[PDB]
Amino acid sequence: MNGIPVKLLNEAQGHIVSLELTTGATYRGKLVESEDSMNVQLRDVIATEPQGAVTHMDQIFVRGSQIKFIVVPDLLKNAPLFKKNSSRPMPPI
Template sequence: MTSTIGIPIKLLNEATLLEAEDNMNCQLRDITVTARDGRVSHLDQVYIRGSHVRYFIVPDMLRNAPMFRARNVRGRGVGLARGRATVNRARGQRGGPRG
């Protein structure tokens, strides 16, 4: 899969994405790098920390990929996620016993 990644100093064009993590750390190979002054260079492999990634441009074919389709979540309830402390505060009570 060929993609483009923008980082603060340079623009990586036509790289093959090997791996991408949840925090946007990514490994690339066969990279074409275009500097701000227009110089083009080629790299074999690169690892980019996710905090330095500004954007990804991926192929349009991923738009319809089944792995990115929303899943229907049923039978999970309302999802208020209230803990014991919130319920006790609503009743006017202090925190529960310790220990």
């Protein structure tokens, strides 16, 4: 399945992220819902074109394979996904 980083992207739902795209566009806004395939949907999006302008989308849906990176907020530095030793409470049967 997923692996740690896209699990983090599944964690940072509804919080102010910033995306660069491969075009150089860095969308920024609240993260409505990410998928496992890194297609991410965003709201109140403020966009920076490659030309240097800035605009405001309301409701964007950027495809995963043109994301350059994504920045989540800082606090997720401390996240239970990163805990190397948290033991599993008897998986279901």
